[PDB]
């Protein structure tokens, strides 16, 4: 019985192999066939590539002991080398060109999920090239989605050295007949098997990937597409900004580039962008995605003055200010979508760019009051009923695990009624008490919530609903600016508070604004459709965001 | 008697003021005297101008309104404007060209010092440009040394109207006999004066000085060069990093750009760095200033294992990962300059350069053991007295403000006997129980290493010198490598332990290594000469790190 898997990375989890470039550059320069690959490996357990896999060399010291035996192989073949010739210059191109092979991690991936132990183990070098960040990046996403990652040139052992599989057993505290074992080079994988490891040549992906779901029992090949890479809230860098005397600010960071400040909407938390911050750290990116005030690790004074917008924005600059950022993109979901918007219109200075998923940007009525607006139209009803403190708190609060379990649920799945929440006199009346478990959510992930919103319950974030007056005013002195800085607006088909058909008129304030639309998608954009959400807020940023 | 001071911004603060690039421009054209100053202000109070200054409009909105105006001036006065022209681009370059006034602001420093509450007042827009970054930074660098920032555009008010003043009296909680007032418009300086202010018109820093210095009864022109920006810890953005189950690094971190990852010696802090970290940071870096395993916030196992080099270096790639970081620039002082040679020795890829402060790299002798190696010299004799547990912990730890105090001092304060620690029997003997303050340090600072020590003492720290052998065994395997990435060696004329003449050999393994000498410099590099460290850094960042 299995519970294992190795992969090799060259020719397994990574392609095209850096082997196979050696060849067709003999192809390409019409040379003799084998020259490129014989001058590689010249000199078998004592030579150049031997002290470079084994970490004897670097390989910047590697790149001329190479040339001396490119020379030596074709002066044995009686055959000269061209002039426009250089190692470094071919295995850039090598290294560069070697990009992830996808279904072989995704495999990996689901390996891993049934309760396997993964393992990479390579033959590979220590890289001191100019240009060595490129594959620094790629065993940086790749060795974070195994348990383990073993490196010739750091144990000082190489394949097929019959050591470095009797290590590889001992870190994987298995047994040989429990590991699978893939790798593109024949005689690297018969230690392996020869030890009484299940074995597989992987020459193309498929086959391999057919013999791996036949030996292991468990279906890879023609699988459902992936849910995107999620956040495990003990792995990840967590933030801490005092924003004044009684007011902290907490985050989570993730990558290196431009800042994008991911704002969560109610009753929310910086987890609810656990599917968006690894793909936009991937996509070059450093997200910092923020717990608000009110939630989480974040302050929650117990004011509802604190969490007018006024104070908000200015404690989100304060946080720029603090952490050394003259800018940030801001990203809003629902109340952070809200903020994003008001952010862009007091602040365009500290805003490289704007986006919001579900929450419109709709101007103040000067005409009019925000409680006589919202009288008008009676989706927002159960605003009415969070506008008395201690009510909401009250019924919010008495069971946790049934609040949020009752709430984040799919477009097909509602289970509550906030249509005349002020008659029937309160917002679970005829929801069931035990619901059952939404496809978007597992019940560890519903836990997390419970466990964050046990430090301050429910006064802070049903504040925000506490300052219409306050934010109506103070909206109604940008009511002669327009929004010019790059902006986004992202609408979900089945939002039915958040209706796509409220972002309509948008174009008169921010007239270069670019849109994004999410088909089947409810209130809950990030949790419902990552994969969607991660793709147009990537090609957005990408072209709007430098 | 005075106790608060007030600046514009344009033309005080920052020069060449924007008001005169206007006139300048008309010079440069050959066009009408005051056509585009004219322009600018023109409709008064009612004027596109003032809604732009009270934030009723944002300056990409005023841009075309302003256009309009210098159509409307040169019909009046019967001439035509160029083909070639653009208010966009006048202003852009006006923006640009607009720097900090230094003196201006080291007087505004220095007020603040010697009790001051001091505030920025300038008539101010709503920066929605393509290129509002730059000004973006020039705000976040100055506001940041002063009390309050009071911007027309965000206060709907604007000078010279008198209730922008009777606002910032209000700000200031203090009576106009109490302000002094800095404007380079006499106008906008009139309300102050009339209010009961004390003012001063800006025409040419050094007399608006001379009148400043002469109010005040502060020295502030001619005054000695003042120290780089430190660090208030309780302003800092504070970063947590678990690295395994046991162990979790804490970070400072300030800026954005390519990531500089700051490395302490012993018995030090992240806050050994606290003059380099805004300087570089306001240079464009984004600053990791760390707390190494067992100081500070950072975890401090018991274990002696747990301080090899091998897993300080191992866990300091692992924070890379969970960070999301390919790669950081690694800085290293004293035992933070060892584990930073060995992070571009064992893992180049995630280097992308590495800089030392005393520290040389001199590599493992493998015919003589490292215990023999330190015997051959007698001011590494401090180190066998580190070797026994326990033993300079409880004389470290005994009085730890008598433990800084003795220790953090300049070149010609000596107040310790490190040879024949070993015969004396003690690191303390002939030392004062109360030693005098160094002028390195205040008070303040030293109470900072006392509290940041009290958490978890000197084991972790001493650990750091308990693993030789392992080191040693460790380092070993690199003898046959090179540092080829970009290096830096800074050595300090006064360290009488790693002393300049211990990194002479150094270009035998690092060829293409940089260069740096500190002149009438201790040890504590950071702390006894900061502007020429973060001189030597900078210059070098910008050349070698991108
Ligand atoms: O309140 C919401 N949005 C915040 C701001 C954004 O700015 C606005 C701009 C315009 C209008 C309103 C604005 O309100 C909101 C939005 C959509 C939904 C929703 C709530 N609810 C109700 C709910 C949620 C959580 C707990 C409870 Cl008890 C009840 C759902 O369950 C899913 S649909
Ligand atoms: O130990 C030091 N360096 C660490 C590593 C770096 O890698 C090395 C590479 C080569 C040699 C040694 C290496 O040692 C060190 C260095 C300089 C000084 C110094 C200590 N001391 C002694 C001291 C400090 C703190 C507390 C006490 Cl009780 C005593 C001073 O007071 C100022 S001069």
Same mark, same amino acid.
């Not at 097929?160 to 005689?187: C, H, N, R």
């Not at 992202?490 to 008169?508: C, G, I, N, R």
């Given at each position: 019985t299995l519970r294992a898997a190795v992969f090799d990375?060259?020719?397994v989890?990574?392609?095209?192999?850096?082997?196979?470039?050696?060849? *067709? %550059?003999?192809?390409?320069?019409?040379?003799? *066939?084998?020259?490129?690959?014989?001058?590689?490996?010249?000199?078998?357990?004592?030579?150049? #590539? /031997?002290?470079?896999?084994?970490?004897?060399? %670097?390989?910047?010291?590697?790149?001329? !002991?190479?040339?001396?035996?490119? *020379?030596?192989?074709?002066?044995?073949?009686?055959?000269?080398?061209?002039?426009?010739?250089?190692?470094?210059?071919?295995?850039?191109?090598?290294?560069?060109? *070697?990009?992830?092979? @996808?279904?072989?991690?995704?495999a990996a991936?689901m390996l891993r999920k049934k309760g396997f132990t993964t393992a990479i183990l390579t033959n590979?070098?220590?890289?001191? @090239?100019?240009?060595?960040?490129?594959?620094?990046?790629?065993?940086?996403?790749?060795?974070?989605?195994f348990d383990f990652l073993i490196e010739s040139?750091?144990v000082?052992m190489v394949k097929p050295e019959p050591q470095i599989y009797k290590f590889l057993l001992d870190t994987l505290k298995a047994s040989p007949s429990e590991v699978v074992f893939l790798d593109?080079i024949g005689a690297n994988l018969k230690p392996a098997r020869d030890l009484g490891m299940v074995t597989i040549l992987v020459?193309?992906?498929?086959?391999a !990937?057919?013999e791996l779901e036949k030996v292991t029992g468990i279906?890879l090949?023609?699988?459902?597409?992936?849910?995107? %890479?999620?956040?495990?809230?003990?792995?990840?860098?967590?933030?801490? +900004? #005092?924003?004044?005397?009684?007011?902290?600010?907490?985050? +989570?960071?993730?990558?290196?580039?431009?800042?994008?400040?991911?704002?969560?909407?109610?009753?929310?938390?910086?987890?609810?962008?656990?599917?968006?911050?690894?793909?936009?750290?991937?996509?070059? =990116?450093? +997200?910092?995605?923020?717990?608000?005030?009110?939630?989480?690790?974040?302050?929650?004074?117990?004011?509802?003055?604190? =969490?007018?917008?006024?104070?908000?924005?200015?404690?989100?600059? #304060?946080? !720029?200010?603090?952490?050394?950022?003259?800018?940030?993109?801001?990203?809003?979901?629902?109340?952070?979508?809200?903020? +994003?918007?008001?952010?862009?219109?007091?602040?365009?200075?500290?805003?490289?760019?704007?986006?919001?998923?579900?929450?419109?940007?709709?101007?103040?009525?000067?005409?009019?009051?925000?409680?006589?607006?919202?009288?008008?139209?009676?989706?927002?009803?159960?605003?009415?009923?969070?506008?008395?403190?201690?009510?909401?708190?009250?019924?919010?609060?008495?069971?946790?695990? &049934?609040?949020?379990?009752?709430?984040?649920?799919?477009?097909?799945?509602?289970?509550?009624?906030?249509?005349?929440?002020?008659?029937?006199?309160?917002?679970?009346?005829?929801?069931?008490?035990?619901?059952? !478990?939404?496809?978007?959510?597992?019940?560890?992930?519903?836990?997390?919530?419970?466990?964050?919103?046990?430090?301050?319950?429910?006064?802070?974030?049903?504040?925000?609903?506490?300052?219409?007056?306050?934010?109506?005013?103070?909206?109604?002195?940008?009511?002669?600016?327009?929004?010019?800085?790059?902006?986004?607006?992202?609408?979900?088909?089945?939002?039915?508070?958040?209706?796509?058909?409220?972002?309509?008129?948008?174009?008169?304030?921010?007239?270069?604004?670019?849109?994004?639309?999410?088909?089947?998608?409810?209130?809950?954009?990030?949790?419902?459709?990552? /994969?969607?959400?991660?793709?147009?807020?990537?090609?957005?940023?990408?072209?709007?965001? &430098?």
């Amino acid at each position: 019985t299995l519970r294992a898997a190795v992969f090799d990375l060259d020719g397994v989890l990574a392609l095209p192999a850096v082997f196979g470039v050696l060849g *067709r %550059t003999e192809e390409a320069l019409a040379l003799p *066939r084998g020259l490129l690959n014989d001058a590689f490996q010249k000199g078998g357990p004592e030579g150049a #590539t /031997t002290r470079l896999m084994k970490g004897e060399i %670097t390989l910047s010291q590697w790149i001329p !002991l190479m040339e001396e035996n490119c *020379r030596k192989c074709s002066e044995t073949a009686k055959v000269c080398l061209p002039k426009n010739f250089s190692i470094k210059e071919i295995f850039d191109k090598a290294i560069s060109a *070697r990009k992830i092979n @996808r279904p072989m991690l995704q495999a990996a991936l689901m390996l891993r999920k049934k309760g396997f132990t993964t393992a990479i183990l390579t033959n590979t070098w220590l890289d001191d @090239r100019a240009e060595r960040d490129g594959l620094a990046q790629l065993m940086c996403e790749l060795k974070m989605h195994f348990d383990f990652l073993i490196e010739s040139c750091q144990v000082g052992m190489v394949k097929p050295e019959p050591q470095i599989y009797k290590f590889l057993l001992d870190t994987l505290k298995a047994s040989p007949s429990e590991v699978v074992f893939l790798d593109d080079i024949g005689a690297n994988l018969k230690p392996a098997r020869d030890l009484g490891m299940v074995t597989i040549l992987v020459q193309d992906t498929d086959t391999a !990937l057919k013999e791996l779901e036949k030996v292991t029992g468990i279906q890879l090949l023609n699988t459902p597409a992936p849910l995107p %890479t999620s956040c495990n809230p003990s792995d990840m860098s967590h933030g801490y +900004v #005092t924003v004044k005397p009684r007011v902290r600010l907490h985050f +989570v960071e993730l990558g290196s580039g431009p800042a994008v400040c991911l704002c969560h909407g109610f009753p929310e938390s910086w987890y609810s962008w656990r599917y968006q911050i690894p793909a936009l750290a991937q996509a070059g =990116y450093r +997200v910092l995605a923020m717990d608000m005030k009110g939630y989480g690790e974040s302050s929650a004074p117990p004011e509802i003055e604190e =969490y007018c917008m006024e104070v908000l924005c200015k404690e989100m600059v #304060t946080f !720029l200010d603090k952490l050394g950022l003259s800018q940030a993109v801001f990203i809003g979901h629902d109340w952070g979508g809200m903020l +994003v918007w008001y952010m862009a219109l007091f602040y365009p200075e500290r805003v490289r760019a704007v986006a919001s998923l579900n929450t419109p940007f709709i101007p103040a009525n000067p005409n009019m009051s925000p409680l006589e607006s919202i009288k008008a139209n009676p989706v927002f009803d159960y605003q009415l009923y969070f506008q008395e403190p201690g009510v909401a708190e009250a019924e919010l609060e008495q069971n946790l695990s &049934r609040t949020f379990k009752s709430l984040f649920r799919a477009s097909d799945e509602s289970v509550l009624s906030m249509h005349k929440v002020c008659e029937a006199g309160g917002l679970f009346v005829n929801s069931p008490e035990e619901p059952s !478990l939404s496809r978007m959510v597992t019940e560890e992930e519903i836990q997390f919530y419970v466990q964050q919103f046990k430090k301050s319950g429910f006064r802070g974030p049903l504040n925000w609903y506490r300052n219409m007056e306050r934010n109506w005013k103070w909206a109604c002195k940008s009511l002669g600016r327009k929004i010019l800085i790059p902006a986004l607006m992202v609408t979900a088909e089945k939002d039915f508070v958040l209706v796509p058909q409220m972002s309509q008129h948008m174009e008169d304030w921010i007239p270069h604004l670019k849109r994004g639309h999410i088909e089947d998608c409810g209130h809950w954009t990030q949790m419902d459709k990552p /994969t969607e959400v991660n793709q147009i807020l990537i090609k957005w940023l990408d072209s709007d965001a &430098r």
